[PDB]
Nucleic acid binder design. Structure first.
Length: 108
DNA sequence: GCCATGGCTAGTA
DNA sequence: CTACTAGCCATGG
């Protein structure tokens, strides 16, 4: 399965997720049948054009945190796009962001 | 061939 | 609960 294919398959999927609900890199990685590949899922979400009509924000790590991203300081962007979804978000004095996973976790 | 680098994850302290 | 190691694997220099 050549890249671009995979790239599509993933996208088709993140359009599948419902408002408010969410998934992780781990999970989409296996959903499309390519489990060893979340790494390449962050990868796919990075490759997105910002004014995309895709729930790029509804995908976090398995720890149920927001990931770093660096070259988009406004990784923060991902948060508020989600409070615009009814999801309560906090942190630690580690000052990350976290959430009640098995609640909002997208169970298909 | 080499390395290093990511929006990762799971295991094990 | 954090904290660190190992694997993981595309992309680019």
């Amino acid at each position: 399965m050549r890249m671009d294919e995979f790239y599509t398959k993933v996208y088709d999927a993140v359009c599948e997720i419902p408002y408010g609900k969410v998934s992780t890199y781990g999970e989409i990685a296996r959903y499309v049948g390519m489990p060893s590949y979340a790494r390449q899922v962050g990868q796919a979400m990075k490759h997105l054009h910002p004014e995309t009509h895709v729930p790029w924000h509804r995908v976090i790590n398995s720890r149920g945190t927001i990931s770093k991203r660096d070259i988009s300081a406004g990784e923060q962007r991902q948060k508020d796009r989600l409070e615009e979804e009814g999801v309560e978000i906090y942190q630690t004095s580690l000052g990350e962001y976290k959430l009640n996973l098995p609640e909002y976790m997208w169970k298909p």
